[PDB]
Amino acid sequence: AMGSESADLRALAKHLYDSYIKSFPLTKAKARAILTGSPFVIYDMNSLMMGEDKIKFKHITKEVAIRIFQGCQFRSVEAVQEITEYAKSIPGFVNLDLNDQVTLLKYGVHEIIYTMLASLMNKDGVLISEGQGFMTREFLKSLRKPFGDFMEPKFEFAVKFNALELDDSDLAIFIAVIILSGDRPGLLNVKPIEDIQDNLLQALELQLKLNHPESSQLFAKLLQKMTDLRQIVTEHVQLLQVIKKTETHPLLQEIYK
Amino acid sequence: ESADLRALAKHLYDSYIKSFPLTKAKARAILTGKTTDKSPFVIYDMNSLMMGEDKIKQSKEVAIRIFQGCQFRSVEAVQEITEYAKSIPGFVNLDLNDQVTLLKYGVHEIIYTMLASLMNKDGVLISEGQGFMTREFLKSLRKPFGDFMEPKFEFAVKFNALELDDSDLAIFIAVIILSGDRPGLLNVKPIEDIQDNLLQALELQLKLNHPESSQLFAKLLQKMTDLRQIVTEHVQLLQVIKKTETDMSLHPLLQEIYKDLY
Ligand SMILES: CCc1ccc(CCOc2ccc(C[C@@H]3SC(=O)NC3=O)cc2)nc1
């Protein structure tokens, strides 16, 4: 029995890494290799126009700021399905009450999207179209109000988050901790979700201790980032309030809400 | 790959349960009175219709009010079906125009597939299982509405004879959505490749769940011919209705679906 707890936690961590690799083809490791230095760079309106020829976008059915926002929504819809697939491989998740599964995902996917978005970001821009393109932070910032300000807070979060230097094996456990959050509103069976999250937290803590021995209290630091993810999501939900009440297919509208 | 196809089948069943509150299993339980709950209210004539509208809980003429009730149920189903479609692996990665086309052309085929789950040869469950409207009452409605539901009943009787359950239907409805022959599709092969995988998953599901049912896979695919004819004939009936009725306020969602459809 000596060492068996450790071994079980490392086995869970490896299981989550392996499934994360299957659910998310464009890993942080691959993204960082692209970002450090080939993708087509969109750095202004003109290069965005030629970018449309070099890259086949799937969301084009208008004004440039609106098309970019719709492109981001298309990608987020794809990410919801990748995250839902990944969640099925979190031990315990599929055996939960079906309604609680839906609830956990409804509230979890946005926090996860912005966590994983940081893997594709550096301080100067973001990979798009599976690494085929790179859009500068400055170009996004330049878009007309209120679209100039919709990606900037995500960049702010990502620069700080990426300074933790987490890798894919760390993130796989962290995103599972996020999904198994017992405090989402409307959950029927809270105790089993907390039990699963307890074991995931143990696994995350041991993973960070072994992978980042030089990083004092990285576990605590990473848990604290949950306050900023929740801030980012809340703030982002408010901005989606504006866009639907100041800006402007019926099936298309259905696909997304 | 066997385990991949079983994992696909289980994923679709789960998302089907998440997306469709009134399953065939529940519809069947109500139809045969097997669990708790009080029997549904039976509407078999004009007097029982009048009272059913009082107990079960805005045109004035009866045939139009029933037709509009069917339209409202359809809008609801479209919302459930589109929610389901997003869960089909690969669907949301398609060109967005093709996503819209697949839903435009698939949604009624699925509506009539799942309508069969609420039908027997004598009538159809309505209002979330709180009512049961008889087939003979529906056939009594004035022209051209006495012919509205009858072809759907003819389909349901033949389709229900296949004895599918919800786990079978979840894969079947995904096969319907991922049809590469819809008019106006831009990227056909990505859709066909997905449907190919769904067809492999459906074939294995039928062989495991229905080992004694010879050629059930083929017989189920043959019902796709019958579903297409129900939809195209329903569009025909809509053209007759346009000529026989005064204003028909059609829900805008149905307006877009029907726009330039057959
Ligand atoms: C209380 C009136 C009533 C309530 C629901 C049903 C059962 C539903 O049968 C249906 C029949 C047709 C549809 C398709 C509807 S009707 C139409 O023109 N377009 C549609 O999408 C959808 C459901 N029967 C009678």
Numbering used by the authors:
A (entry chain B): 203 to 239, 245 to 268, 275 to 461, 466 to 474
B (entry chain A): 207 to 263, 273 to 477
Recite the paper's sentences.
Peroxisome proliferator-activated receptors (PPARs) include three subtypes: PPARα, PPARδ, and PPARγ; The PPARs are ligand-activated transcription factors that belong to the superfamily of the nuclear hormone receptors. PPARγ which is mainly expressed in adipose tissue, liver, and skeletal muscle, regulates the genes involved in adipocyte differentiation and lipid metabolism. The PPARγ LBD is composed of 13 helices arranged into a three-layered sandwich and a three-stranded β-sheet, with the C-terminal AF-2 helix (H12).
The structure of the PPARγ - pioglitazone complex has an identical space group with very close cell parameters to the lobeglitazone-bound structure. The structures of the PPARγ LBD complexed with lobeglitazone and pioglitazone are very similar to each other with a root-mean-square deviation (RMSD) of 0.47 Å for the 260 Cα atoms of the A chains. Pioglitazone was absent in chain B, which has an inactive conformation of H12. The major difference in pioglitazone compared to rosiglitazone and lobeglitazone is the shorter length of the linker between pyridine and phenyl groups owing to the lack of methylamino group.
